[PDB]
Design a protein around this ligand. Sequence first.
Ligand SMILES: Nc1nc2c(ncn2[C@@H]2O[C@H](COP(=O)(O)OP(=O)(O)OP(=O)(O)O)[C@@H](O)[C@H]2O)c(=O)[nH]1
Ligand SMILES: Nc1nc2c(ncn2[C@@H]2O[C@H](COP(=O)(O)OP(=O)(O)OP(=O)(O)O)[C@@H](O)[C@H]2O)c(=O)[nH]1
Ligand SMILES: Nc1nc2c(ncn2[C@@H]2O[C@H](COP(=O)(O)OP(=O)(O)O)[C@@H](O)[C@H]2O)c(=O)[nH]1
Ligand SMILES: Nc1nc2c(ncn2[C@@H]2O[C@H](COP(=O)(O)OP(=O)(O)O)[C@@H](O)[C@H]2O)c(=O)[nH]1
Ligand SMILES: [Mg+2]
Ligand SMILES: [Mg+2]
Lengths: 426, 426, 425, 425
Amino acid sequence: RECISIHVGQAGVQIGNACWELYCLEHGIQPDGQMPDSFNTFFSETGAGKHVPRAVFVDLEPTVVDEVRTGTYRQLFHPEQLITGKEDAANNYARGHYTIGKEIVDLVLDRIRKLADQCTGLQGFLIFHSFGGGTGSGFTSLLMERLSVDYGKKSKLEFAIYPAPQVSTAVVEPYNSILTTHTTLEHSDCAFMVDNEAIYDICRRNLDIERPTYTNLNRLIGQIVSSITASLRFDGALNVDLTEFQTNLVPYPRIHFPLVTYAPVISAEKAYHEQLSVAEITNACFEPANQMVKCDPRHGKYMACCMLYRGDVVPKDVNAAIATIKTKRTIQFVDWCPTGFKVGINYQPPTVVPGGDLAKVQRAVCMLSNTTAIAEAWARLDHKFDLMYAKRAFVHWYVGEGMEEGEFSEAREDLAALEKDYEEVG
Amino acid sequence: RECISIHVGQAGVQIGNACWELYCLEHGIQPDGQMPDSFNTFFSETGAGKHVPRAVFVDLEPTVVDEVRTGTYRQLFHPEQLITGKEDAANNYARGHYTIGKEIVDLVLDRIRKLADQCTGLQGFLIFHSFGGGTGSGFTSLLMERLSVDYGKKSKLEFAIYPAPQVSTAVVEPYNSILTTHTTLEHSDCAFMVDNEAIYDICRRNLDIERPTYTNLNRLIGQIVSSITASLRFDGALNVDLTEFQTNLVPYPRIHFPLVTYAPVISAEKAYHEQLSVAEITNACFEPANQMVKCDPRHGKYMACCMLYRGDVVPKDVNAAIATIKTKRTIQFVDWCPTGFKVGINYQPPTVVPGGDLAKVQRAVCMLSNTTAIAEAWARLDHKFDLMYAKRAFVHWYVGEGMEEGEFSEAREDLAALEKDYEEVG
Amino acid sequence: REIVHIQAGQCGNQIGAKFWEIISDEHGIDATGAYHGDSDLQLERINVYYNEASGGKYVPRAVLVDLEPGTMDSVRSGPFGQIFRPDNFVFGQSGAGNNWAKGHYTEGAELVDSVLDVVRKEAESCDCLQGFQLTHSLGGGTGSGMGTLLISKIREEYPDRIMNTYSVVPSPKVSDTVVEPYNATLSVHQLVENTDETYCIDNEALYDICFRTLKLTTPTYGDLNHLVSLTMSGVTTCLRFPGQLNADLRKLAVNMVPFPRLHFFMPGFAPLTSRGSQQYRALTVPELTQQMFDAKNMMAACDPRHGRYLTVAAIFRGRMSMKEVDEQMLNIQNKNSSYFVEWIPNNVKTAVCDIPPRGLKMSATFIGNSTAIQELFKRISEQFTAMFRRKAFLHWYTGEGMDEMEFTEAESNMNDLVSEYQQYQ
Amino acid sequence: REIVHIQAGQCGNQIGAKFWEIISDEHGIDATGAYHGDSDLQLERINVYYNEASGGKYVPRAVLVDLEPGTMDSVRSGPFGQIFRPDNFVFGQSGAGNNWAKGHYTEGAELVDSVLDVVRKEAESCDCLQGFQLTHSLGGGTGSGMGTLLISKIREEYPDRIMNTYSVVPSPKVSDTVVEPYNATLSVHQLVENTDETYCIDNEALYDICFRTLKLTTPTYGDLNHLVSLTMSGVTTCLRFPGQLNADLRKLAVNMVPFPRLHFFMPGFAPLTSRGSQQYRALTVPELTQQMFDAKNMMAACDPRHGRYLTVAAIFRGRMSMKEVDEQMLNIQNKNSSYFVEWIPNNVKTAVCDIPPRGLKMSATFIGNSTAIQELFKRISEQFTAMFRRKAFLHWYTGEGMDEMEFTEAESNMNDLVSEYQQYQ
Ligand SMILES: Nc1nc2c(ncn2[C@@H]2O[C@H](COP(=O)(O)OP(=O)(O)OP(=O)(O)O)[C@@H](O)[C@H]2O)c(=O)[nH]1
Ligand SMILES: Nc1nc2c(ncn2[C@@H]2O[C@H](COP(=O)(O)OP(=O)(O)OP(=O)(O)O)[C@@H](O)[C@H]2O)c(=O)[nH]1
Ligand SMILES: Nc1nc2c(ncn2[C@@H]2O[C@H](COP(=O)(O)OP(=O)(O)O)[C@@H](O)[C@H]2O)c(=O)[nH]1
Ligand SMILES: Nc1nc2c(ncn2[C@@H]2O[C@H](COP(=O)(O)OP(=O)(O)O)[C@@H](O)[C@H]2O)c(=O)[nH]1
Ligand SMILES: [Mg+2]
Ligand SMILES: [Mg+2]
């Protein structure tokens, strides 16, 4: 069982940076690549006492990849796995797909084949990127178009960051976050959606940190990715696989946008007072004040959710805790789904990173619900992009790069159809 | 078998603080939270060597809660349980119920549901508040309106402080202490009343100390609370329960205002000369010079009362001591009360607190009598409020906050009826 | 010919615990179910109260019920606590709060299935039993509430076999609860019809016996339950040991109850003497017999001198002579011809057993059905008549669905019962 | 008369792991194939699950199956893991992902050749065998997909022998997977015809037995698999030890399966007692028999009191008395005449073995064929009609080519099965 992770853009490299420090500590592997087993899913051996990851770093700017080349973790990554450009996308989807997309897309696609050669039972790829900028919108969408043709059946996972409705940092964000919607919809088997504001609220209220900067927000994302793949790396009472996961969750081909949430997240001092048991944590995952994207499940009806516990858990009570929520009419599920839970229980406790904002725990829960509440995160956005295109602002920048005037028609017609599907199933 | 306490206003942190020093000493639980059983009706366990109280501290000003946050007893209470506001009520029942209350009433009510999740056989809540201020009059009345709907049949006990007729510190006290009468009447299962000045005479004469300040007066109230719930927490010859208590006491739904008193309270040096036997400490309870609220039972007829003896007492003489008083025509009972004594004997002696003003006893008594003397405490203060409202003074302050002009009409019409009921039964 | 045991309420267990402490002593059963006796007569009729288990151990045939868990721990943790089988420990979780309404309708309806499953199990194990025996108090909420419900359901299952209850009916001078009259009157409406035999005990009197006759300065509930246990133990000694003349539970019922409603009895025991005054007595039947009918040692709140005896029974234990027992019962009837009903000659029934009480030579028990019980009921009723008139405390019970017809028939049927005793007086 | 073992899926292994741990202790085999027993009766019929190897060692007649490699490491490294021959571990590399479609068509088509080569080897080695037994769970993808395929292929090769399946059928109250109803429906279309004797077990009822009767506070899969294995070990006691009356597999099938389609059973075992309450029981047959028929102790989610038993069988172990077995069989039948079919006189099959379970004097197993299984099937199918009507999750299965006739055929014949139970109730 083999898996390879791809990081795109500044956002991808930052999120990728936090993960690969996390993975090393999990398996006791030094930054030099020696271990003072089961790590082969992510790591490759070289003779004796050398471990190198199955990573590729992709970027169109030298500056934010020149950081990893000099940082503490320079000696882990194989030098040519780590690719840079010479001119940026200048926050354009138009330059991302067409003008600068085709000048590096071949170089990395050559390396994927070298990395896909050591694999023996390959599951799929892990993609980290964001919908804000031009590099991670145009170039990333270019890889899924190339990867889908070449491999076909085996699944691809990507972890997107959606632009906020209110707290956003760029000017032209709606243009790219609408044009990406085509390639995510027809070329991603399960698409994970994460927002930037909701990470802050979790930091303010639950985690009690005054000033969350980008160091902490990435460390929260790293914990989720470790939790999903802990089923491959370890063994426990009940096991859930990535192919086993897709079947239970995604109900129709057009609906693969799970919402993620994690528990427990708690401060160092607040850990001593509360008793963290299975029956109480599983209730926290369903709190609308803990969801990772600003949606209210109170207006949505669930049809799937997955519970992934790790640590000291027994299936006797997990039966009762799930049945407890089944009795609540506050939390609503679809009528044609009499049972709607997938349970996976693992035996290895989660590992806390030094320099982080989490306290050592015996149990942890990760929840993945495929709810229809998310329909608002796109319909609310599409008003912004529709507001822009009435007067055709900024369009002169994109037109000169090659894409035509109706390209936005498919951009909204694709999104218009997708909101209907969440209605029809709704 | 669970019980949860709520402290509201300054008067709550006043009284509530002294109780939780007392409770910890009773159960051998050090301020750090560890015990170097039966304590589960008030405390919660977390893993190993950690107990925290089942309490919520409520306040609408920052000053009087920052005192517990820094004091010796900071390590017991969970940080979320200590709730403060930003602007205090400024002696407005108008602001308390309507303007400033509604912006915090939701926050705590979320935690009451969190604290009521761990209960398995919950009996009810204990509320510590006073009719003097505006915070504990308006906001507290807001909780009982919310709590009553959410639970219904569960019993709620509140420990009120009534304003003294002469020894009082505010100017508009009758305005608050009349408008609270509605919510206590229809939304409290049993309402204890105590005045502040009467605690002085008991402290002046019996205790023989010069200057009673608010530290000592709370310690008297703390002992009454512990005595009632010592039946829930321990085991003895004959037992009385909280629900079993109200059946013996409250004769009609409209009449639930018992008077309280305690025996013995004694100094250190006067403790050596008296022999403390069962026979007379049951006679000290009916001394009208020892009653805890300034009323004369000589003008009223007892229609119920309850005794709670703790220590080394036996049922043989308790019947004799009760039989002795029944022969007195000085102490009068109603014709339809051939017997009116419910007794509960408990085996565990009361515990003395260091820094207090009481000496060790082997036995002690708590008396709760539902008498008709208390009619004078309302109809005689109702003249004060009526004297104010002739010239319509101070009304401009409350009118602008939302309540209308006739709100006082119900305030007197309700109180006129409640005094009328005490006439009919009398 | 065997008996099963039912105990209800906090009152029943403390009564019930002492019964098993002394009766294990008679049969030699240790605190761990073993056997260490001498007389083979212990093992001849052992199975009347015990059922054998593997490994040479015996456990009692008791079905112990409760409605709060607080009183459960003490009986388990006390002396002779491990004797009982854990499955028989049946208890609720909420409590009754001194309510008959909750004890019958709201809370007893849910625990009724659990216990009735167990008493059905103990009924099948025994080959041929005759009766169930129940100990409870007639003043509380659970004891009156559930004890009524079990008796109603148990009876219709077995209308042919005998039933015993050993109730404690309250007294005014040691009154303890504000709502006592409501409890007693509503409960008695059943025992007039749904039980075969009823023993009445007044908690007031057990103090009079401990001050005066036995010289006690500190009567705790340890000692009062001691007095009652020796009465219940004594009635069924014929079933467990041989004798010249025999009388079992069914024999007494026919010979003492003249009419179906007149089955409210009046206990008594002798000798009862202080530990310092006991070297200054004889050891002979005449001293035992006079102390029997003495109006000062009887164990309820009545004076029999206010009426005439219908019938009695006197059960003697020890090696005795049969003329002496009968020559004396005629002496009292001839000497005291005023205090006995005239149209039933020779009202006294007799029985003698062989095995004496441990540590003694002789003893006796008195079960005498009198016409003086009619005052125990109007005295309690007078408490109630001043209560329901003004509807005091009434709404608490009315919340569960009772109707004023239930109180009116509660008053009427007590007047129905009182009239019966005065006409046959 | 020896019988080979097949066990499939992740679930089948832990059920299969405990079987070989228990049965080695029964036959005295150590963890390395050595023998250290005492009774020569162990070696009289040893070859029923074991075959002889060089050096005085025995290795089991186990054929072990899997479709993912993770569960292999646990069983190989666990206690009594080295008993198995390495060639017997037959497992794939990809996985099923909870699909019946992949388990029968895509992944079962390739790995089926490897296992059938091994089971063909076990058949020629043995001289004269009677059956195969398979343990699997009916909710998952591999166990349902591969298990149903092997049963089809095995049956065609050997139509003349008896076949056993010990299945686990899921329940809504303990539901764990969003696609459980699709798995349970698609499989049973074939067990209605391609197996001769089928046992149904619910994970829901296993939790009832461990909570209530056994007083277990933490039921893990270590304990639940303990309960099932004692049932498997009990059915084949007559094959391995002598007794007054004998009953092998063919004797049960003829006597207790009335019609060809009515072969879905309900386990039940007794005694099941806690480690604290075991000192308070007797050692006698009557206490065993009354526990078998208890609606509270049976091993599925059915109440037999909702229907009438067709036939039963009770298998006893220990030195016993032959009247005490058959005399109590009529006590149940006449005293409970309502719960048994009227036109089948003396519905009960009997058998007694000699050698008791280790550490015990007596035990027994109940296999009762009831008409109450008719409720287990509409309860599952109702789950399925609420989903397939709106075509949820259907695209995952349709990618492998199944047609809606397959679902309708699944629904029609399950209605055909449910119909057959109602008229003969
Ligand atoms: N977690 C995390 N998110 C980031 C970080 N930097 C930027 N973002 C998010 O990314 C969005 C901006 O688009 P980018 O992902 O930075 O685009 P880019 O990676 O710079 O690629 P270019 O358009 O070619 O410059 C912002 O809305 C941020 O929310 C980071 O360091 N960590
Ligand atoms: N026992 C006791 N009583 C106190 C104490 N402090 C104040 N009181 C009583 O409280 C009354 C004053 O009204 P409060 O209840 O304090 O009003 P508040 O709690 O400050 O609420 P606000 O009106 O919103 O400010 C006085 O009449 C005192 O009798 C104390 O420390 N101990
Ligand atoms: N004789 C006797 N009476 C008792 C004892 N303990 C309690 N009682 C009586 O029981 C009455 C109260 O009934 P109670 O036990 O509370 O009924 P419950 O509600 O079912 O527990 C009191 O009036 C006591 O007189 C005891 O040990 N012996
Ligand atoms: N009785 C029992 N059931 C189990 C055990 N392990 C898993 N199961 C059940 O098996 C069912 C699904 O089996 P599954 O894991 O899909 O088998 P697979 O398809 O071969 O992987 C679940 O509903 C579990 O309840 C066990 O050890 N004992
Ligand atoms: Mg960039
Ligand atoms: Mg204040």
